[PDB]
Design an enzyme around this catalytic site. Structure first.
Site, short mmCIF file in Angstrom:
data_model
loop_
_atom_site.label_atom_id
_atom_site.label_comp_id
_atom_site.label_asym_id
_atom_site.label_seq_id
_atom_site.Cartn_x
_atom_site.Cartn_y
_atom_site.Cartn_z
N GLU C 69 33.76 25.39 38.94
CA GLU C 69 32.76 24.69 38.10
C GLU C 69 32.67 23.20 38.49
O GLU C 69 31.60 22.58 38.42
CB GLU C 69 33.03 24.79 36.59
CG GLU C 69 32.78 26.18 35.93
CD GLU C 69 33.76 27.27 36.39
OE1 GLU C 69 33.47 28.52 36.29
OE2 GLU C 69 34.84 26.89 36.90
N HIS C 139 35.26 32.51 25.03
CA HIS C 139 33.86 32.97 25.11
C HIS C 139 33.10 32.70 23.79
O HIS C 139 32.12 33.41 23.44
CB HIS C 139 33.82 34.44 25.56
CG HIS C 139 34.59 34.70 26.81
ND1 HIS C 139 35.79 35.39 26.83
CD2 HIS C 139 34.38 34.28 28.08
CE1 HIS C 139 36.26 35.40 28.07
NE2 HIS C 139 35.43 34.74 28.84
C1 LIG Z 1 36.97 28.74 34.91
C2 LIG Z 1 36.24 30.09 34.67
N1 LIG Z 1 34.99 30.38 35.09
C3 LIG Z 1 34.43 31.57 34.85
C4 LIG Z 1 35.09 32.62 34.14
C5 LIG Z 1 34.33 33.96 33.91
N2 LIG Z 1 35.03 35.05 34.63
C6 LIG Z 1 35.80 35.98 33.96
C7 LIG Z 1 36.19 35.96 32.46
O1 LIG Z 1 35.50 35.28 31.65
C8 LIG Z 1 37.21 37.03 31.93
C9 LIG Z 1 38.59 36.40 31.71
C10 LIG Z 1 36.75 37.73 30.65
S1 LIG Z 1 36.57 36.93 35.17
C11 LIG Z 1 35.68 36.30 36.51
C12 LIG Z 1 35.81 36.93 37.88
C13 LIG Z 1 37.07 36.41 38.58
O2 LIG Z 1 37.15 37.13 39.80
P1 LIG Z 1 38.49 37.24 40.59
O3 LIG Z 1 38.29 37.75 41.94
O4 LIG Z 1 39.29 36.02 40.45
O5 LIG Z 1 39.32 38.41 39.71
P2 LIG Z 1 39.04 39.98 39.52
O6 LIG Z 1 38.19 40.38 40.77
O7 LIG Z 1 40.36 40.66 39.55
O8 LIG Z 1 38.20 40.17 38.23
C14 LIG Z 1 34.86 35.26 36.00
C15 LIG Z 1 33.85 34.45 36.88
C16 LIG Z 1 36.40 32.32 33.66
N3 LIG Z 1 37.20 33.19 33.01
N4 LIG Z 1 36.95 31.06 33.97
CL LIG Z 2 29.99 37.44 25.51
#
Ligand SMILES: Cc1ncc(C[n+]2c([C-](O)C(C)C)sc(CCOP(=O)(O)OP(=O)(O)O)c2C)c(N)n1
Ligand SMILES: [Cl-]
Ligand SMILES: Cc1ncc(C[n+]2c([C-](O)C(C)C)sc(CCOP(=O)(O)OP(=O)(O)O)c2C)c(N)n1
Ligand SMILES: [Cl-]
Ligand SMILES: [Cl-]
Ligand SMILES: [Cl-]
Ligand SMILES: [K+]
Ligand SMILES: [K+]
Ligand SMILES: [K+]
Ligand SMILES: [K+]
Ligand SMILES: [Mn+2]
Ligand SMILES: [Mn+2]
Lengths: 390, 335, 335, 390
Positions: C69, C139
């Site tokens: 971000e 969230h």
């Molecule tokens: C700083 C930041 N930016 C975006 C996100 C949104 N997010 C997610 C959440 O909100 C989850 C915990 C419900 S998970 C995610 C994908 C992360 O991908 P990755 O390859 O690190 O992990 P996975 O492929 O194992 O899901 C995002 C963009 C987040 N959790 N944190």
């Molecule tokens: Cl949501």
């Protein structure tokens, strides 16, 4: 054969960690020796006389200006200053390899780029004095230069923030179909911030015509590179991001010029980022607020960018003692003229404290401006009004 | 200069940076787990607050990090999760923002979100703060109001060397993550007697430094000295008796001391260097209005920095100085 | 569910995400420089707000970034420095914090600190915002008060699909960096008629959505619907006439519309999902108290989220719902 | 010879950019083939029968639990869920190579680590239901597990924040003279955040006994790795930071185990960080809020961690159809028992919304708690009180 989406690779059937190559790092590109002799004729850029003389005069004028403004700070005539000693070669070598309109973002120790682009002495001084001629309106601390005419984005103090901005500006240029590159200067300390990782990765994945230019001068204030990182410098990080990388002798104008020229050609052509790490040494204190003898000189006397270039000019028959004397004098005069003029100018109207916060002035902000105006009407004898315009 | 700086065993004259060093010294001597780290702290720091500690306590306990504020705070959280005392330094309050996510999403929420299975109560983040005459946009800022909207952290600002050592010792020892903001203009501006040995000043408790009956003045940091002088101007020029209060802890703040004062005086003036809009005086004002509505004789006045970035050459016109505060007070008294 | 959702040429029924898409569509069609980018925007985004735009406008104008971000916002600033329109998306408002330094130290200050030689006026950052029933700590957040203390940016929150398209078009076109917060619970909750063609709603202007004479209620986002219902409960259960106001722009805010209302009613209740302490209702309350001191018949009431992180299972007890607002209103009327 | 403080290197007299090696990346370590046969006897860890069976049963129990909780989410019994399909091997292979007390930080897709450490089914379910048995007190969204007893730090949603925290906890362990390592799991998407660069660099410069474990599963939600980075994956970044690095087949339990075991030995001994990148594939949707057919399966049917391990057990005479059937049944029962119990439990007292914000409860916060109490006395019929404790 491996099928994973995340990497292109073979299998290996034996456990082997990849060891970093820190003791034999990326070698340091050098064109001329410390006696200003060309080492390898095929690498000589053969810059014409007038250009090399401009590189030389820009670096000594900066040095002259640095001496005078450093003294001005010690006496409290300006509030702050940062010199550029030892790094003058990285500034002018790189700036000379750029097109006039290539957009520059910097850190704060790159004033030679502006000097090379013919930024007036009057304006360097206007900013350091915060006087009426300052187009920055006296709002930022000294050495926070910016010039729209010369495509040099205003410096800000927060380290490395300009790195992912430079990348966005490079993306936009790509789209505009510019034949333009963006260059982005930062030191080795600033390369530790999160923003550097953001910019490097964005540049590579979004395919941006940018040059990342790292001045590695061995210290971030008091902190030596041994406490800043453990890999082989900044240059060795580039490949991990998919960025083409090179390390250069930052005290060798022609090495810096050559790498910058080729990065520029290839960045614009291919829409791909290049990383240059210029190895140098910070010869002065970090700033006027720093006494650098508290944490650590060969470099000044034996490996200086200006002396090396001066030896080169003499080898071509392009300079001599008489010319050196006359120019030492002309440059002192040019700088002292700008300096005296800068001190005699008033500071801008205190009104300018409120404008440009937004493009327009919101009504609540105008009301604060009005409040100041009424305040000064009643209490103005307690304020330094006679130094400020209107 | 816009301000004048004006039981516990042996004391020595200490300036503010020295009293920070004394606090840190006492902490490292009595708590073997405690470490100090951040940019340039090893050689004694750019404001001299850690001079001699690495020599005294060792390079493993007083050390430089890479130049990365989000890393510094993330690292301090991790140390504190293990139960060790982590004293992180952020070089200027203006550079705390890269760490905002670690402070707000992580350190503030660590105990709550885990059901108290984990915490980082043993983290303290110290940072020079406030104007300095010439710091301009990025060596002058007062970010306390940004942090006041974050449940889970404590934010603390001293006004003097004696206050600083007692409040910092309190933050270091408090079982919650604390941000301690040190007014950098005071670092070398007048000394006072400071106890050699460790002692504590309570968090979340304002200090009434001068009793008065006509109006209540509230500030914190250097601005306390500004309101103290305003009280003096008001007594002399208007015959107005001012109650002067140092809030000291931004959150959680001492609502009761403030409301009690205002219930007696009927008038309140809050002053801070930070911009007016969204500044912490708004929270104080709103709350006092809610609690002391029947007692308030005049609208609550806020004398703050303007809603601009902090300027270089215009600093003398920007700050909420003694004349700005006095005039506002004059008008509030005439209401 | 805690809420009920209840001239310009051809319109179509649109939900909130559709009206965001329409706004973005109109923007890309008329401004060749405009680009949209952030995490997962290419396939249409995780809330569907960019569906079909990459197909329509091209992969160079609607694209995914790496998951960073601070990079997204730094990148958007850089694009806008060149004069091109940069529409950055931050996936949840809770994840805007890694970008706080780029927003506060950089985008907010870019015009001022350069003397207007450079600017990033053509940056807009859009981000889902506010509670969603089950989003818990990361969230659900409403970060607007953090940004309200930052001179140089504009912060804007719509309450409906018609409002969202007109306000987003305003942000995109405004010559200042803008953060547009989209209440995510409304994304697919009731549609209304939205003009197909582009139109603008003014920034810094509250909207009086219901006239009343006894009390003024102020909120923004989903909470407007909550106060609208409170007005209804108050008329019915107490015979109280409520003036209901949607603030819409957090900064710079429409001080005059609010003060004018309160000068007529004499009572003010502000409500927001964000925590009480340091929340934006404090700034509104302080200011109204200052301007409408002679008119105020009762202490200004703030009905806000509690001073905790936003919980998962306890959400129904956390939010400043219609009953919490009604009770506070009842008591304020009995004052 | 170059003298610069910032790098150890030779001069070069010719201009040459360092090109990244992306097409022939770091090779992928593999111990057993897709038929569960050992490829190279000298790499076989020869884990005893009971241990391998525990790896196998932990991965199928997780799979059983994932199926049931995913269904529970679709029906709206819990608010959210994330499965672990395809990545079960990285979890249990790595957890088995750790000491019981090695401190774990994770991301959210590592529940097999807790399962391997015998975290009760009742507690996985308590957290997903936010019920009275949840030691997290129902405050965080589902799958945000934490266990102090099993040295598994509570998950939080913000990506990559745990990376520099893990590094601080590793520093503290060093100081404590722990003979303990910290491991820090994150995905390839999360490795793009600034915090990853912070943690990697801090680990190397401060000399921390940490293992960085990157699950590279090819996607971050909808974003393929081609939009996430342009270098050779995460593993190729390690060397730039001075970190020892390896890439492993994340579908091969024994490859994961071997790399993790050796990183652990060497991290603790040398106080130096290791980076492991486990190449895998995210077989499920990203979460219950995601329909993954909108942006993209071989892996499930032909390269699955669980099937591979099952083939291995049969080769030793360690499992057969009868045992597979009886365990499929026992595990279904164990999970359905925990599930029914979890649904019948009340949610915690609404009072718990106010505690642990600070260690103590500040008086102004207690006053808000009192306000809620009085509110519910008058208006409680409008709230779901009968589901909540007390
Ligand atoms: C700083 C930041 N930016 C975006 C996100 C949104 N997010 C997610 C959440 O909100 C989850 C915990 C419900 S998970 C995610 C994908 C992360 O991908 P990755 O390859 O690190 O992990 P996975 O492929 O194992 O899901 C995002 C963009 C987040 N959790 N944190
Ligand atoms: Cl949501
Ligand atoms: C995000 C952040 N953190 C710390 C600083 C403090 N700082 C400085 C300032 O405040 C200047 C602009 C007056 S300069 C500086 C040293 C940076 O070292 P470097 O190697 O990047 O650059 P130089 O060796 O060329 O000074 C720090 C830590 C800062 N400017 N920004
Ligand atoms: Cl001197
Ligand atoms: Cl300073
Ligand atoms: Cl379904
Ligand atoms: K900068
Ligand atoms: K503490
Ligand atoms: K805009
Ligand atoms: K996390
Ligand atoms: Mn440096
Ligand atoms: Mn992934």
């Amino acid at each position: 054969k491996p099928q994973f989406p995340g990497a292109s690779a073979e299998f290996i059937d034996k456990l082997e960690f990849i060891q970093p190559n820190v003791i034999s790092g990326i070698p340091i590109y050098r064109v001329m020796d410390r006696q200003g002799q060309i080492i390898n004729p095929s690498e000589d850029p053969h810059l014409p006389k007038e250009k090399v003389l401009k590189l030389y005069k820009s670096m000594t004028l900066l040095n002259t200006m640095d001496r005078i403004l450093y003294e001005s700070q010690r006496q409290g005539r300006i509030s702050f200053y940062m010199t550029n000693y030892g790094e003058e070669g990285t500034h002018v070598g790189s700036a000379a390899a750029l097109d006039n309109t290539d957009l520059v973002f910097g850190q704060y120790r790159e004033a030679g780029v502006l000097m090379y682009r013919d930024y007036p002495l009057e304006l360097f001084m206007a900013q350091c004095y915060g006087n009426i001629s300052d187009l920055g309106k006296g709002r930022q601390m000294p050495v926070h230069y910016g010039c729209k005419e010369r495509h040099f984005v205003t410096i800000s103090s927060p380290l490395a923030t300009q790195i992912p901005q430079a990348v966005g500006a490079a993306y936009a240029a790509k789209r505009a179909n510019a034949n333009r590159v963006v260059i982005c200067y930062f030191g080795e300390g600033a390369a530790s911030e999160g923003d550097a990782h953001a910019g490097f990765n964005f540049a590579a994945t979004l395919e941006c015509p940018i040059i990342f230019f790292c001045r590695n001068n061995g210290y971030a204030i008091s902190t030596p590179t041994s406490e800043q990182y453990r890999g082989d410098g900044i240059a060795a990080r580039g490949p991990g991001y998919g960025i083409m990388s090179i390390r250069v002798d930052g005290n060798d104008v022609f090495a810096v010029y050559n790498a910058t020229k080729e990065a520029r050609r290839r960045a614009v052509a291919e829409n791909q980022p290049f990383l240059i790490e210029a190895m140098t040494y910070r010869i002065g204190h970090h700033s006027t607020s720093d006494d650098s003898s508290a944490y650590r000189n060969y470099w000044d006397k034996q490996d200086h960018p200006i002396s090396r270039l001066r030896h080169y000019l003499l080898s071509q028959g392009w300079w001599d003692e008489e010319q050196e004397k006359a120019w030492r004098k002309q440059s002192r005069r040019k700088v002292m003229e700008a300096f005296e003029q800068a001190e005699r100018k008033p500071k801008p109207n205190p009104n300018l404290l409120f404008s440009d916060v937004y493009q327009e002035m919101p009504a609540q902000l105008r009301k604060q401006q009005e409040s100041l105006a009424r305040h000064l009407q009643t209490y103005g004898e307690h304020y330094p009004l006679d130094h400020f315009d209107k | 200069a816009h301000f004048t700086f004006q039981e516990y065993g042996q004391t020595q004259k200490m300036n503010l940076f020295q009293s920070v060093t004394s606090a840190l010294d006492n902490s490292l001597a009595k708590d073997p787990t405690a470490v100090i780290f951040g940019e340039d702290v090893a050689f004694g720091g750019v404001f001299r607050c850690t001079v001699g500690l690495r020599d005294k306590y060792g390079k493993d306990r007083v050390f430089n990090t890479p130049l990365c504020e989000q890393g510094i705070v993330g690292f301090g959280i991790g140390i504190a999760v293990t139960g060790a005392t982590a004293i992180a330094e952020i070089q200027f309050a203006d550079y705390i923002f890269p760490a905002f996510d670690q402070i707000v999403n992580e350190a503030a929420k660590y105990r709550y979100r885990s059901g108290d299975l984990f915490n980082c109560g043993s983290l303290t983040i110290r940072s020079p703060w406030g104007c300095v005459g010439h710091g301009a946009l990025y060596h002058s800022q007062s970010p306390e109001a940004f942090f006041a909207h974050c449940p889970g952290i404590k934010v603390v600002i001293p006004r003097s060397p004696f206050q600083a050592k007692g409040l910092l010792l309190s933050c270091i020892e408090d079982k919650n993550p604390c941000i301690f903001f040190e007014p950098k203009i005071l670092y070398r501006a007048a000394a006072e007697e400071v106890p050699i040995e460790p002692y504590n000043i309570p968090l979340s408790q304002a200090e009434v430094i001068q009793e008065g009956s006509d109006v209540t003045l509230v500030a914190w940091g250097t601005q306390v000295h500004v309101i103290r002088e305003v009280a003096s101007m008001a007594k002399e020029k208007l015959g107005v008796s001012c109650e002067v209060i140092d809030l000291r802890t931004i959150i959680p703040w001492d609502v009761d001391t403030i409301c009690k004062s205002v219930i007696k005086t009927g008038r309140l003036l809050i002053s801070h260097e930070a911009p007016l809009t969204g500044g912490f005086a708004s929270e104080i004002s709103s709350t006092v209005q809610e609690e002391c509505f029947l007692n308030l004789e005049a609208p609550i006045s806020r004398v703050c920095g303007y809603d601009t970035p902090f300027p270089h050459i215009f600093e003398p016109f920007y700050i909420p100085d003694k004349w700005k505060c006095y005039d506002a007070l004059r008008k509030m008294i005439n209401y």
